[PDB]
Structures are given as C-alpha cells and as structure tokens.
Structure 1
Amino acid sequence: AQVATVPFRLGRPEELPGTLDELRAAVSARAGEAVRGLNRPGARTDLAALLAATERTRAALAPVGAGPVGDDPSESEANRDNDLAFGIVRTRGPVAELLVDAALAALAGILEVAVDRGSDLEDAAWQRFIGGFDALLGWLADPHSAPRPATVPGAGPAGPPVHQDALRRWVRGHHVFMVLAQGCALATACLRDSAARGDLPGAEASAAAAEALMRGCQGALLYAGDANREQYNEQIRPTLMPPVAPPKMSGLHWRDHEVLIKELAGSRDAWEWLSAQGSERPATFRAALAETYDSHIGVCGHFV
C-alpha cells in the first residue's frame, strides 16, 4: 500500500569498484551533479524544499539502468527472497552510478514521509541519518578528500498516526540501509587498497568516508528501530485473517551487508596503520562502529 516506491533498483555489490581511482572514474561526474542538485539555492531552507530539490535532481540525471539483472548464478534463492521482501530489483548497469540513483531515491522516500507527517527522531539522530546521504554523495563526488558536511533541515514533530505508516518507514529505512551498506563497503575497500599501496592521503579520505557513513547507518538504525517499535504496538490487535508479518532482512542472505562486513574484516590493519601515522579517524570510527553495532538491537531479527 504505497509503502515505498518500487522496484528499488540497486546494482550488484560484488561489482563495486575497489580503488579510489577506479571509483572516481566510475562515478565522480554523476555524484558531483547529485551534490550540486541537493545544495542548489533554496534546497536547504526546509524539508519540503529539500524534497523538491531531490526530485528535481534525480529527474535531471540521465538514466543508466539496463533493466533487471535477471539470471544471476551468484544469487541464491535466499538472496533473492531477501531482496524481494523489500521490493529490491538488482539492476544491470554501472554499479556506482546506480548507487547514486538509489541514494537519491531512498532520500526522497524518507523525505516524503517526514515532510507530510514529521518525525519523532531526536534532532541529532535526524542529522546524522540525513547527513549519511551528504557524506555518501559528497565523498563519491571527490573520493580522494574527506567529505564535508552540509546543513540538514529539521523535521517537524510526528503528526497523527496514519494506518501502517510504521511499515512505510520500516521499508523505506531498509532501502537506506542498502545504499549505506554499499557506500561503506566502497569506503572500506578503498581504505584497504590505499593503505596497501602506501597512499596515506587516500587511506585518510577513505576512513573519513567510512566513519561518516557508519554514523549515517546508526541514524538509519535508530529511524528503523523507532518504526519497528511502532510496528510492534500495531501488531497487538489480533486478526481473524492470517497475520501479515513485516518483511525482515536475513543477515546471512543480505548481499550488501555480506560484502560490507567482509571488507570491514581485513580493514583492521589499515585502521591500525592510520593510527600509527597519526590519524584520529580510527578512534572515532571505532566509536561509530560500536554505536552502530549496538543499534542493531530492536531492528535486526537476529538481535535482542
């Protein structure tokens, strides 16, 4: 029931670029347009203006998809069920440019609900949540530099409850998860590659992206946890019809998360090297990491 704009098109995370130079060649032109679109005059006056700017930005971008991937021998049935439960369609085309499109669409998905009906999220959570998109697109626009944050308009307070708005937020929040998971996997991969090649500035820029994306993921988890609590209250009503359970991500079978955690493993030496070279990113990333891990409680079905 208009829970989210679907299909939600996303590339295969196994094809994400793995170096800063490759990433820049793949996406920096398009990401730069996206950033300029989201920071155009007037875009940041209020949440309604940001939504309008988002929709004008994504309309102004030339499409890049080539329709569904279709037959993918690397995709298990459990992967497919994971994606279908949230309306995800794996789509052929330049994976990093598809990530830019997906980021803009997930942003618009969030802002549609917040513009109409507010948010109960703490302003600092809202800031890091929506700030996750600025971090991602700003870094993709210039991967060799740390992304700089921009202003994020606040949301009004939650309005009157509308039927299954919690499910809309739950589903649209998971679309954000998939964008941030791919973004953080990119950032972690580039950190690993940069450090292996002794590119300390590239490593530092990659780690700065990874931390900002990780803080964005913590905001998204708070957002989804807030929706999940409201969902649980809405399930107290017993139903004569067979009860409809909200979609749930698997973990084992969610490909973007699998790719992310594999990159994070084996980024350990790069984080220690950055520390030894006098970076402050490792310490603050470690904090963001612990906070994001804890905020799984109340969102992911294999926690709590």
Structure 2
Amino acid sequence: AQVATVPFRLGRPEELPGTLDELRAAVSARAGEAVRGLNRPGARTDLAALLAATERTRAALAPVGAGPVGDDPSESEANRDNDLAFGIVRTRGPVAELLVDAALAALAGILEVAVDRGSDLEDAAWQRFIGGFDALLGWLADPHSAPRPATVPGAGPAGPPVHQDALRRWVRGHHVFMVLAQGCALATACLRDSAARGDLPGAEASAAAAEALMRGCQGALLYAGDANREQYNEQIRPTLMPPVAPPKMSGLHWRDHEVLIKELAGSRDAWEWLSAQGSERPATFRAALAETYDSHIGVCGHF
C-alpha cells in the first residue's frame, strides 16, 4: 500500500526449530550470509550505506519462499485478520530461513524512512532498536555464542512530517514486532531445552540472544508509540469522510506473540538455573523484560 512492503512473508512460529542444533543446521548458513552482508566494508559509515548493504544482501540471497501457506487448520480468523491487518502472509518453506528474510525485509523497511526523513527517536533507544537485528542475525549465524554488538549509525533529526509517514512507521514497525517476536521465541525455546539437557554454555548464549532481542523490542515499542502519538495528532482534523482507522492488533492473540509468551512462561526455572550457575544475564533480562512490558503503554490498545 506504499506505506509498507506487502505482502510481508513470514514463517509459521509453531514450526520454529526448538533446539540449538536443529536451529544451526537449518538457519546458520543463511544467517551468516546476512551477517556478512550487513558488515561488509563501508556498510556502517552512515545510515545510507547500511540500507544499500541490506538490499545487496537479500538480493544476493537465493529466496526460499515456497509460496503462501494457504489452508492452515491451526490458524484462527483472530490470527488471520490480525495477519491481514498488517499485510502479513504466512509462507511455506524453511521457517527459520524465512525469519532471516523477514528480518532483512523489515529492517530495510525501517531504514527507508530514516534515510529520507531521519528519526526523532532518542539516539540511545535507536541503538537497541536496530541492535535487535544484529542480535537476531548474529545469534542465528552462531546459536552457540552470544552475539557481539556491532556499530549502528545514527539517524538524522526528524524532518518534515509527510502525510501519514507516522502510518508508514506504524505498519513497518509492526513487521519488526513479528520478526523480533519469532526470534525471541527461539532463544527462549533453546534456553529451555539447553537448561533441561544440562547445556550450560548453550543456555548462556540463548539467554544472551533473548535479552538483546528483548531490549530490541523495547526500542521497537518506543518506535511504535512515536508513530502512534504522531498518529493521534494527525487526527485532530475533522474529516467529512469516514475517518479511516489505523490498523490495530486485536488483543494478545497474534500468532508470533502467542508463541513468545508461551515460551517465556515455563522458561522460569531456566532463568533461576542460570542465576544459580553464576550467570549475569538473568538480572539484565528481567530489566529488559520490565522495560518492554512498560513500553506497551501508548502502543497496544488493550493496554
């Protein structure tokens, strides 16, 4: 709809790999490709070369999309209308590798607006918001080491508010939601599995990935509210037409979010287990966890 790239191809979060070995054999080859693309020389000089690097990468990548899913018996209309509302199409194929394409696609969508018209988001919140991609792809490239944070160029100050540019950031922002939700769902399932199997190094890396993905979602919720408050201001005009409403998420029941909170639940005993074995991630995660829950205010309706 010229506000976001549609359809946004995405995997079924239920089919996501569940253990650190199944994740690596499935996604580490395509993720490491994407990591090499987003850190090739010159790509981090400014925000412009980062967008060009994002496009060269996903262009070079052999697309894995085996078409739309279609007849899905596990999908409800509460999931479908929620998927339609933001142009999401569930796509057949390597679900983990699709998450790599969705990440590269959603990031490029965020980078277009910030190159033409900058961003009034704080330079500290801007970092964790983009670093969530570096976290996801860096960890997907090597699910057994904590991802090391790379440099993220700044954004210019917010230029002239173009018509419904806060709507472009509202739809393009919700794609980052489902991208980062699936990723954080992985690192929790791997943390749960590694903990039960006595994989202490694997538990540490998965927790580190989940935390940087949680901090990356907090910055995604600030970016969302920045565009929703700017939306609330854009509607003081009395409109003789029926006032077209911004697409909203219909309650907690969007698919990737349903999976992530189920993963987060029942992962309780693993976080306490990491804290006992001398880890420092259990503390800084609960920080990012509460920071993210607070950041729903101003973004989610039923909230």
- TM-score scaled by length of structure 2: 0.99
For residue 86 of structure 2, give the secondary structure of its aligned residue in structure 1: coil
SS at match of 2:9: strand
Deviation at 1:253, TM superposition (A): 2.3
Q: CA deviation at 1:268?
A: 0.2
SS in 1 for 2:153: coil
Tell whether the 8 Å contact from 1:251 to 1:258 is kept in structure 2 after alignment. no
Indicate the percent of aligned positions where both proteins have the same amino acid. 100
Deviation at 1:238, TM superposition (A): 1.4
Give distance in 2, aligned partners of 1:299 and 1:6: 22
- Count of residue pairs the alignment pairs up: 303
Tell me the distance in 2 between the aligned counterparts of 1:2 and 1:113: 12
Deviations 1:127-177 (A, max 9, x none): 000110000000000000000000000000000110000000000000000
Question: Matched residues in 1 for 2:277 and 2:202: separation?
Answer: 13
TM-superposed deviation, 1:252:
3.2
Q: CA deviation at 1:78?
A: 1.3
Match of 1:147 in 2: 147
Checking the alignment, whether the CA contact within 8 Å between 1:251 and 1:257 is kept in structure 2 is no
Paired residue secondary structure (1:123): coil
Q: Which moved more, 1:27-36 or 1:1-10?
A: 1-10
Give the Cα–Cα distance (whole angstroms) in 1 for the partners of residues 180 and 249 of structure 2: 15
SS in 1 for 2:59: helix
CA distance in 2, matches of 1:257, 1:154: 29
Output one character per residue of 1:164-197: Cα deviation in whole Å (capped at 9) or x when no partner. 0000000000000000000000000000000000
Q: Structure 2 CA distance, aligned partners of 1:2 and 1:42?
A: 29
Conserved 8 A contact 1:23-1:96: yes
Deviation of the 1:207 alpha carbon: 0.3
1:20 touches 1:194 (CA, 8 Å); kept in 2? yes
Shift of 1:251: 3.2
2-structure distance, mates of 1:219, 1:57 = 24
Q: Distance in 2 between matches of 1:18 and 1:101?
A: 19
Q: How does 1:1-304 map to 2 (within 5 A)?
A: 1-303=1-303
In 2, Cα distance between the equivalents of 1:253 and 1:296?
Answer: 15
Q: Is the 8 A contact 1:34 1:58 kept in 2?
A: yes
> Structure 1 CA distance, aligned partners of 2:78 and 2:267?
27
In 2, Cα distance between the equivalents of 1:251 and 1:269? 28
Q: How far apart, in 1, do the equivalents of 2:171 and 2:300 lie?
A: 13
Q: SS of the counterpart of 1:89? A: strand
Moved more, 249-258 or 229-238: 249-258
How far is the alpha carbon of 1:37 from its aligned partner? 0.1
Deviation string, structure 1 residues 198-217 (Cα, Å, up to 9, x no partner): 00000000000000000000
Instruction: Return the alpha-carbon distance in structure 2 between the equivalents of residues 251 and 66 of structure 1.
Output: 30
Q: Which runs of 5+ in 1 are unaligned?
A: none
